[model samples]
Target: KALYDRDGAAIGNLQKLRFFPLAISGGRGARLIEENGRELIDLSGAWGAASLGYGHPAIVAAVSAAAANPAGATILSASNAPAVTLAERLLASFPGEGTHKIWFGHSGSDANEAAYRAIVKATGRSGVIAFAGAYHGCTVGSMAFSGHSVQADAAKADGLILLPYPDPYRPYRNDPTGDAILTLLTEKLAAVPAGSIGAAFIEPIQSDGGLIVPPDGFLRKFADICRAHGILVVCDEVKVGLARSGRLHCFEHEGFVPDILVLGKGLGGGLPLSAVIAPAEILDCASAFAMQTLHGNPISAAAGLAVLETIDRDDLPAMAERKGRLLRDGLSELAKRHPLIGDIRGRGLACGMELVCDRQSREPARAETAKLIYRAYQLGLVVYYVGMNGNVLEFTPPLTITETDIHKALDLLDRAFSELSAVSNEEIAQFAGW
Candidate 1:
């Protein structure tokens, strides 16, 4: 394979998660490799989808079994054992309120797109709303509704609306608590008229924008507002779902149920299968195979069933919560030791530590933050860092990662930050009243 040289200091490799100039040969533990035999502790965890870690025996076997199947085409006729069993398992675990059904997709973006299609079809609304920092996906529908300004594209006819994220970092002008989120959303919704606004989409914990956890009573209240106006609530769990948030879903943190629940990321274990789960009452509005373009796909279903079973048998969700606490605590202590690290926040396996030039101002230190990321890689630790301006280090490892691995990764971060905050040897000599 001939690889071309790329310019700029971008983490743009291997479908985006392949950041920090490194390579892996093979591994069954919570670590990976560099091309020259150097191994680094994998804190990134394949963007938090590796619930079973890399190369778990069960994952490998289950996917192999699914692939070896000879009756791949028969699943489309009515239903197959793998698809039925997997769908049943997911529907049972899916947290919602009412008659539930499942429609699978290859990516979270597509599943959300399917959910958007259903919302538009059911509510008869052409418009939708999402938070400013929240990321749904990159598909046309998901992208247009995406609140990340960097990924913005022109709306196809006012079909999407971007709302202020309820992050209190900068704080909302009128209301930072999201009580005002409803009023602001209503104003946006009113622009398209009743029955024209379809659904409101959100990630329970805003993962991409440095893990901006909404304040208490925000999500439930937002759901209430959507219900009051007849709009469906679509929760994007593509990143933080499936035990990453200590619960089966993070929305459970606030005791709220969205109209449609989206599942992706860890759904396929290590494969490429995502899904949109819903109740039968609202889903009945659509036709049979309404979203299934080719009747259906079977191999993907088999892969999903295998992945869900692995997650269940190993008890990875609880494991994630345990390791997550350790990581958060370790980083919290690091913050107390270093002024550059302003704050640390997390929910189970999803967590982040923000870097600031001055904590009083909360101004992001983009250049210094970039240096920290680059140096951590040389120390043989694979981690992720992202923010609007790139100033926070995100620590979302696989749910299956052990507490030991978590500590090792923390050591790498600690070493880098510890060194960066100290004065140079030459500076110390000069400062001794020479």
Candidate 2:
């Protein structure tokens, strides 16, 4: 009733997908409390945004102080201490070589939007290359660069080139092996119309693209391809950045750096914040082009500072690696029992459990995936599913979630699978997909 009065019309009609079955009243330490007082174990971490978990004292204190500060979220080029300090902190800890400058934005969408424009203005090229199944943002310009099916909704931009993303599990047609995918990618990039592409945008680990992790040396080779074409590379770490993938940046795992690195989702603690950090010369686009009235919100910057401070002080990156290993190993063991589990892949705390009808066929179990989500919800566990076919169950629990919570969630998941044995294809036609 309350949802209807407030958000039912807009959320039901305006929004596209509603993964959550119900709304929440509050949250604490990777747990969401429904209005009815039902406590749900939060394994999705608000799609990788709640890195510090819910209601951390450090974030609360920093945000509270920033909110009260006399500077008070100044705008229109009026600088604030927290925003300036955050820029310095971002540049110092970027984990990439060379000095960089950071641009602040309210969400991953805006951050990538700014990066796209900056790359175009810097290189004076109109074409851009992106991967199929890639999701940059929902904005028109960024959406044009995205390879997700949502791009089919309307006419796409003229200069954006969509290529296949290298998936180790579901290898490309001719490139059956993981290593050969990079060769195919290089060839494709070379074949693009000359002087058409200004940049190649990619996600180190394609989070929304079914947690797809390309083969080793793939990014390096891709970078070389772009360099040959005089095209810049921008790594969109909006979902897996900031120590989520066992490193400060996922590209570090591949040993290659991007020309522009976009960070968001986890950088702002619980507030809305995103950043685009790149070489000074590359970001020296036309003056005032990146300006936004609320881009450098001091409150969000202070929250971002708190997130970095906590990550460093507590060595959360190391913790994510260790804890992620535990989760992955447990999922592997679970796969031994559930034949529906086709593949499990990821790094650090970001991982995916791809559901399939059979191991031999590799047919996606889209209906079963939806059933498992509903079953898990009934058991007080929250999870999210993503993939081009919507058959992958993504696990992005907060790095701060306790080991006890993790085991509990896994136990609930086991029970959910146990109870889902009776579902059949006839009853799941609505959820079936490619």
Candidate 3:
């Protein structure tokens, strides 16, 4: 209680996904241990960074090996054996390689920032395009490229254009056929001066944006439009990549490839590592453009290699697909019992359950979302809420979570919903948006 109380009093609270004040002592696989000795299921996976789960054997072994090495944690302008090996492996594993190169950093934000700089330097263009509801990163450069209102309000920047993302749940009514989305993109790019717009950042699934997944052919068409404008496409895989979306890369599901692929979250197998992969020509910018003291960290690279190997050897992508189906089907069944469930959208293990006040009106159930999260926590399960509106319940349990754990979490969720449903709308209103 003191830790929680003190944290509430003095510490920073910028991280938005905390539904309850709980202090974690340790974690193993899909279950996390509280300092008070309670074990709770971890459905958030440290916001998708713990893809291999906590205390994974492969990661521990690889990190230990790297620690015992005498390299002393090398950084920028220096190369070590593990870092070089990881670079080679990443380039080889990338889809359809043609002289691909990588730039290492500490997080997805780091990767995206560097990628944006390279796009600017490579094309000698400053204008960048992004979509509404996009959350790129917190840095000034990446913040400028983001369309999240919170980030936009924090700071204003020039030379950035934003377009409405195609949300199937709350779609553009005028674009019933979806052709109008493409038309708008084409017109906007055409209006920009030729060779002035450098790159475009996109999330194949738009995770933080209410788990939005555009309809089929949307991304392909969008990519084609950007290509026509001679703009580089930077795909942000920070949240949904690395088998969480049931593929090595989520972009694969959309049937397209990015000129620059920004990867993070699970790349370090629980440590801090992020990277951007692009063609050699694009990455051949000035040497000091994106340097960092801890860039190409040898220890993190070792962990990354172990993660990639474990994923490939265990066929984790295929496993994610199978598990994702099980989880989605289970959530859909819960929706039938609870009319509050507005919609569910996701692929693979990355999923969201949108809560609504009415089936037809689709009023955001923000209050209910918070209550459900707290109730689930009291029942020994841990989940999180996402979306700009904060009405979408996000679930990203470790990919290695057992089927038994999955079922148990679902049972607890059902109970939480059942109890909450008994409260009248008036009572719910009292706690709405708590």
TM-score of each: 0.88, 0.93, 0.94
For all candidates, what are the clash counts?
4, 0, 1
TM-score for predicted model 1 compared with the true structure: 0.88
Measured on C-alpha atoms, candidate 3 has an lDDT of 0.82
Residues 57-155 of candidate 3 have per-residue lDDT tens digits of 999999988888835466566668888888888888778446788888989888888898887787789898898889888788778788775575656
Candidate 3: stretches off by over 4 Å: 14-17, 174-176, 421-434
Pick by TM-score: 2 or 3, better one: 3
lDDT of 1 by residue, 1-434 (tens): 21212322443432343334455666566677555677787777777766667787777777677668733543334666766677788888875676788777778878877787776676567777777777787777667677664455535326667666677665677476766666777677677767766788988888777778887788888888788877788889888888788777878887788778898877776666788787675566866534544323556666667667766776766776777888888988888888888878778888878899998998998656666765676787777677776787887777778777878888888887755434334432321110
TM-score of 2: 0.93
lDDT of 1: 0.72
| lDDT tens digits by residue: candidate 2, 103-137 | 88988888888888887788778788888888888
* Cα misplacement distance, residue 312 of candidate 3 (Å): 0.6
- What residue runs in model 2 are displaced by over 4 Å at the alpha carbon? 2-6, 9-12, 174-180, 186-193, 421-434
Best by TM-score: 3
